[PDB]
Amino acid sequence: MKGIIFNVLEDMVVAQCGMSVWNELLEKHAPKDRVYVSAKSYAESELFSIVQDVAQRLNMPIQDVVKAFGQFLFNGLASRHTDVVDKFDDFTSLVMGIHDVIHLEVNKLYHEPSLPHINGQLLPNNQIALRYSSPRRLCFCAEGLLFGAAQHFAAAIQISHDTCMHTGADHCMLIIELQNDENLYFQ
Ligand code: HEM
Ligand code: NA
Ligand SMILES: [Zn+2]
């Protein structure tokens, strides 16, 4: 898990809960004097432990917290990798380019990142079938991110998530409906 993910998480926790809470989280779930260098790899268990702690503090379902983080996370990355996201002029293009453009770039920007396997298929009625697969099973982070990407393009979406690794499958299917964006008028 790359430091950049931890950095954006810090920004989120500091904004919602305060720096005092972030320091508690860091002292408890990370070794002494931990500093997350953005480009460096760290143990994903450090992230999961922090996020699980946050969920418990807020009395929220863990996946609802991961989804919220995902939405916050898209803006964090879009602002840290503005050149990558500016390759796309709309939400649908970006989603269709997550694997072959965005995360492909991430392999050139970062040393050996740990990334999901994603494939998007355009459907009729302005829908997208996004297939997700990863041993980390962060499909709800992916949902959040998609909602973040929608917000970035002033678009509105709904997501159905009825095939899932958490209910036994070896992948998730995220069916995205684009309800509105700047190029969508009556239908
Ligand atoms: C809707 C858009 C996106 C989706 C759905 C998505 C999906 C994901 C997910 C779910 C993960 C967690 C790892 C896993 O699941 O195995 C991940 C990792 C990552 N992605 Fe994204 N992503 C999106 C956009 C972006 C953008 C815009 C960037 C930066 C330009 C980016 C760069 C990264 C990085 C740096 C990691 C961490 C890799 C590591 O820790 O080794 N992604 N991606
Ligand atoms: Na519109
Ligand atoms: Zn899932």
Domain residue extents for the chain: 1-187
- Ligand 1 centroid distance, CA of 28 (Å): 26
- Own/partner pairs for 26-34, CB < 8 Å, 24+ apart? 26/50, 28/53, 29/53
| Right CATH for 1-187 from 3.50.7.10, 3.90.1520.10, 3.30.1490.100, 3.40.50.720 | 3.90.1520.10
Distances (CA, A) of 51 to 63, 120, 156, 171: 10, 28, 27, 23
C-alpha count within 13 angstroms, C-beta hemisphere, residue 119: 3
> What amino acid occupies position 169?
A
Which of 42, 98, 101, 118 to mutate to test ligand 1, by most ligand atoms within 8 A of the CB atom? 98
Does 113 sit in the ligand 1 pocket, CB within 6 Å? yes
**Residue pair 65/53 in contact by the 8 Å Cβ criterion:** no
What is the number of other CB atoms lying within 10 angstroms of the CB of residue 76? 19
Copy the structure tokens of residue 107.
Answer: 């392999």
Q: How many helices (H) and strands (E) does the chain have?
A: 8, 4
Resolution of the entry in angstroms: 2.2
Q: Which residues surround ligand 3, an ion (CB under 5 A)?
A: 139, 164, 172
The CA distance from 74 to 127, in Å, is: 21
Residue 173's φ and ψ, nearest 5 degrees, are: -110, 115
Which ligand number lies closest to the CA of residue 187? 2
Method of elucidation: X-ray
C-alpha count within 13 angstroms, C-beta hemisphere, residue 27: 6
